[PDB]
Amino acid sequence: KVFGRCELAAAMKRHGLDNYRGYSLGNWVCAAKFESNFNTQATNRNTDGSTDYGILQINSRWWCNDGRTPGSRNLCNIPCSALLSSDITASVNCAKKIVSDGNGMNAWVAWRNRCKGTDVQAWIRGCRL
Numbered sequence: 773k774v775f776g777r778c779e780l781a782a783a784m785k786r787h788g789l790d791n792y793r794g795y796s797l798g799n800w801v802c803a804a805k806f807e808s809n810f811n812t813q814a815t816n817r818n819t820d821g822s823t824d825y826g827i828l829q830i831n832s833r834w835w836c837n838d839g840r841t842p843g844s845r846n847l848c849n850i851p852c853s854a855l856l857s858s859d860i861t862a863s864v865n866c867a868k869k870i871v872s873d874g875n876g877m878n879a880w881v882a883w884r885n886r887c888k889g890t891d892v893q894a895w896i897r898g899c900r901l
């Protein structure tokens with residue numbers, strides 16, 4: 773599913789990311805924009821041989837199992853395919869574990885490089901929430 777911006781903002785709010793770990797909703801929306809362009813089905817093979825899955829590009833070496841990443845820990849206890857669903861629940865639940873891991877949203881390089889410190893509230897502006 774490719775979400776529009778305000779549609780994803782409302783889904784992420786409904787799923788409890790607004791202010792999760794202190795990160796306002798616009799941070800999550802901005803991160804999803806730059807990780808996946810709001811496409812739940814996005815997959816990308818990483819240089820380390822792992823693959824990133826879903827709207828927040830969650831990684832098969834640490835977080836989900838894809839059966840093809842040597843060393844996998846599957847700390848979210850889910851198949852990586854679950855992160856591609858039109859239902860964002862599994863992505864949200866695993867993202868909540870990731871952002872709790874110690875470095876906050878810096879676990880997403882794209883958030884650090886493109887969202888952190890910017891006017892992230894712009895990503896929610898205008899939306900009925």
Ligand SMILES: */C(S)=N\c1ccc(-c2c3ccc(=O)cc-3oc3cc(O)ccc23)c(C(=O)O)c1
Nearest residue numbers: 775776779780782783784786787858859860861
């Ligand atoms: C896309 S645009 N927006 C969108 C579409 C569908 C859902 C969503 C649900 C929304 C509210 C609920 O109470 C329950 C939902 O269950 C869903 C189940 C599946 O399989 C897929 C989508 C569901 C959302 C959303 O989760 O907020 C958003």
